[PDB]
Amino acid sequence: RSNYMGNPWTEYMAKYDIEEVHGSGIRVDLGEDAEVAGTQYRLPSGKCPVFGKGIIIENSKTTFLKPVATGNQDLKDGGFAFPPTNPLISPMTLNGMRDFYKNNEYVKNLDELTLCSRHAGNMNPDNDKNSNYKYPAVYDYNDKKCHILYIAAQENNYCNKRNSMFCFRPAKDKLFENYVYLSKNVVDNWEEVCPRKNLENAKFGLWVDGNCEDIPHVNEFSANDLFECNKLVFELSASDQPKQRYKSHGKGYNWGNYNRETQKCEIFNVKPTCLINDKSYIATTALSHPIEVEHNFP
Amino acid sequence: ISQHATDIGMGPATSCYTSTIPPPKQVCIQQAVKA
Numbered sequence: 001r002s003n004y005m006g007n008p009w010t011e012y013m014a015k016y017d018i019e020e021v022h023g024s025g026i027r028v029d030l031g032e033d034a035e036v037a038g039t040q041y042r043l044p045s046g047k048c049p050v051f052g053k054g055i056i057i058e059n060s061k062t063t064f065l066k067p068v069a070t071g072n073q074d075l076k077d078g079g080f081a082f083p084p085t086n087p088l089i090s091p092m093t094l095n096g097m098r099d100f101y102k103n104n105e106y107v108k109n110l111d112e113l114t115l116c117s118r119h120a121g122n123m124n125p126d127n128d129k130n131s132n133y134k135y136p137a138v139y140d141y142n143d144k145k146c147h148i149l150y151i152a153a154q155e156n157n158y159c160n161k162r163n164s165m166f167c168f169r170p171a172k173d174k175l176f177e178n179y180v181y182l183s184k185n186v187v188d189n190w191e192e193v194c195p196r197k198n199l200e201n202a203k204f205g206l207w208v209d210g211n212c213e214d215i216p217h218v219n220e221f222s223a224n225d226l227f228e229c230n231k232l233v234f235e236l237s238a239s240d241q242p243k244q245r246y247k248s249h250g251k252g253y254n255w256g257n258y259n260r261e262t263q264k265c266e267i268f269n270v271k272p273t274c275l276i277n278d279k280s281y282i283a284t285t286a287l288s289h290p291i292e293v294e295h296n297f298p
Numbered sequence: 299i300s301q302h303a304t305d306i307g308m309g310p311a312t313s314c315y316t317s318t319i320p321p322p323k324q325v326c327i328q329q330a331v332k333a
Contacts, residue, residue, distance in 0.1 A: 036310045043307065071329030078332065085325045104319060123315035123325055131318055133310065150331065153307035158299065163332070242305040 007207040009274040012298055014193065016204070016285065017271045018238065019250035021193050022048040025240035026254060026286045027170050028154045029183055031247055034132035036125060042240075043152050044136040044183030046250075048194035049113045051289040053234070054138070054176030055080060055154060057168045061175040064168075065091075065138060068150045074162035080151040082135070089123055090148035097146060110188060113139055116146035117186035123148075134184035141178040155241050172231040172290050195285045197294035198226055203257045203281035204272030212274035215257065218266035226282050229258040229265035230290040236267055237286030258282040 007013075015021055024031030024046035031045035055064040057079070069078030082090035092100065094112050097119050101107040107118055120137035138147045159167035170181075187193060205212040219236075223229040238252030257266040261280045275283065277297050311333055314326040 030307045039304070039310065041304060041307075041309055043309070069332035070327065071332075073332055075332045083327050083329075083331065085327065087325070089325060101319070107319060118319075122317050122319045124318050125310055125312040126314040126316055126324075127310060127312060135309075150309070151307075152309050153303075156306055158302050158306075242302075246305065 003209055004207060004273075006210065007273060009207055009212070009298075013273055013275075015195055016255070018048075018254045018285070018287070019271070022046045022238075022287065023250045024183070024185075024238070025248045025250070026050060026237040026252070027234060027239040028241040029136075029181075030152075030154075030240040031183075031249065032185075034128075034134075035130070036133050037127040037129070041133060041152075042246075043133065044154075044181075045185045046183045047185050047187045047190075048287050049139075049186055049190055049196075050181040050287055051196060051292075052172045052177050052179060052230070053170060053181035054173060054179050055168050056171050056173070057166050061173055065140070065147050075164070076162045076166055080149050081138075082148040082150045090120075091145045092119060094144040094146070111191065112144070113180055113182060113190060114186055114188045116180075117182045117184060119146055120148040120182065121184045136184060137182045139180040139182060141180070170234075172227075172234045174227075177290060195287045196289055197292050198230070198258075198288055199275065199283040199298075200293040200295050201277060201279045201281065201297055202275045202283045203278045204255055204268075204283045205274045205276045206270075206272065207274040212276050214276070215266070215268045215270065215272065218257065218268050219253070221265040221267055222263055223258065223265040224263060226258055226260070226284065226293075227290045229256050229282075230284050230286075230288060232256065232265050233267055233284055234286045252286075254286045256284045258284055
């Protein structure tokens with residue numbers, strides 16, 4: 001029957017269909033495989049930018065963008081970023097990248113996030129005959145710097161001793177609020193087809209028989225503010241981390257309806273198909289920025 | 299453990315790189331990455 005027909009929300013709600021628009025893990029994105037000199041590797045592949053995502057290394061929230069340990073350094077002295085090269089490839093400012101690609105009309109005018117992704121996808125290992133492997137990156141809005149990540153791993157907690165493998169986990173945090181985690185597949189029109197802003201005075205719902213109905217079942221987590229609700233949705237979202245096949249393809253608890261008055265983060269794993277206008281609510285996603293709101297309804 | 303490093307996303311031990319965006323340019327890590 002036609003219970004889902006005549007939905008005026010279809011185009012507007014397309015960006016909230018995370019399996020379709022992102023198509024990979026969020027918390028941990030390892031949605032693709034790449035063969036390099038006989039060995040199979042895992043790599044981030046989500047089509048959307050992940051706003052406010054960083055990696056916490058053994059309590060330290062200020063280390064993951066530091067270059068990876070080289071030469072005589074012990075492994076725990078470094079972070080996850082590409083080490084210095086001659087000439088320098090990473091980090092590079094937005095202006096530095098626009099200047100670097102000035103003769104390339106297909107690259108030079110890309111938005112900052114897509115440009116960072118394409119710059120990180122540029123240098124290919126000489127061992128990689130088929131150019132399969134493309135590094136992920138972090139864009140820092142505070143100083144407009146693109147950081148190529150040499151380490152594509154996002155979680156490890158097999159971990160411990162300065163030379164032993166460090167323990168690490170992904171998270172939204174005040175210290176990561178200006179970061180953007182970018183896979184090699186970030187789409188050039190993410191602004192149009194991916195989430196970013198939290199929706200003020202709105203709650204996600206499901207369109208049924210010409211009306212926007214409430215999500216029938218939600219998982220209630222208490223949250224002091226929108227930021228804490230966004231952190232909880234991220235912690236529960238699509239994950240490609242090995243549980244022991246290890247690909248979520250974007251499936252997970254990716255959405256939350258934040259009631260600012262009851263201070264409840266109403267978390268769910270089914271895609272929303274409409275919005276309800278309710279002044280008590282803010283609609284968030286695991287991909288969304290933990291602070292920014294869009295005051296206007298829709 | 300070797301399999302675990304691959305399953306969590308650890309990438310290839312790589313020293314030299316070549317651009318996929320023109321012009322072709324070689325870039326090498328002067329000192330080896332701590333493994």
